[PDB]
Structure 1
């Protein structure tokens, strides 16, 4: 698998007050930086999401989404998550996508900071697509604690069959 060019980043919210965690940090190929949902007041509640345009080249269809948690500490990583994909011809930009359709994939991540890979069905649109990665709930401050209400992602990407 090969990494797919990403562009046109969007997020349901982002924290820039309590720390510097804007949406761009989930796409900069740097495991030491992350996007964080907004938790300073007025805070954002679940679900949280990130969205981007994936451009695998004409003729190709993306194969998977990868997710890398923040790497400094465990602080309630994503648990149940969902992936939406729409053809790029459906809207002018990521921000113009109103209807994401049914999820093409769901996963329950284990309690960890290691890289997660979500395989996508071979029936999704080929070509350039808009992608939304959505965190519906989260792990707790420990593995058996009540789930937290925020989210953080160090790296998000699409891959394609090389």
Structure 2
């Protein structure tokens, strides 16, 4: 019932730890002020960028939604076109082991905003413990109409059940 789910075993396509302290862990710490950021220091990562983690909802429940909160400080090309993949935690030893994520169970286009975004998931996803990949295919520019940025940042990523 609209409640948050234990996350663990965090992974990212890339992360910045040189130019600033922005590891994947920043996206799961329940602090709006901290964010994961893609590696932009040289050699910089490119799109798509993603975060993944394990969601543990309890035995008799299923994750209903992924939530995304951008950084809150400024508008710096927030995520635009996103995709969520899901597999059963049994599918591998850890998040990082997962070699096939299947078809996106959900997509979303986010408005030009810092506000919290919710992506409801289909009930065809496995029950109980799941690995989740949140992937950013496209980003906003520095205005709505300028060319999209090549980097990504997320202050918080979470699953509800």
> TM-score range, shorter-chain basis?
over 0.9
User: Any stretches of 5+ residues in structure 1 without a counterpart?
Assistant: none
Deviations 1:9-54 (A, max 9, x none): 0000000111110000000000000000000110000000000000
Deviations 1:46-78 (A, max 9, x none): 000000000000011100000000000000000
Q: CA RMSD in A?
A: 0.6
The alignment partner of 2:90 has SS state of: helix
Q: TM-score, normalised by structure 1?
A: 0.98
Divergent runs of 4+, >6 A: none
Distance in 2 (CA, whole Å) between partners of 1:51 and 1:142 is 28
User: Any stretches of 5+ residues in structure 2 without a counterpart?
Assistant: none
The alignment partner of 1:71 has SS state of: coil
Q: TM-score, normalised by structure 2?
A: 0.98
The alignment partner of 1:25 has SS state of: helix
Deviations 1:64-121 (A, max 9, x none): 0000000000000000000000001111110111100000000000000000000000
Deviation (angstroms), 1:143: 1.1
Distance in 2 (CA, whole Å) between partners of 1:156 and 1:90 is 22
Distance in 2 (CA, whole Å) between partners of 1:26 and 1:133 is 12
Which residue is equivalent to 2:78? 77
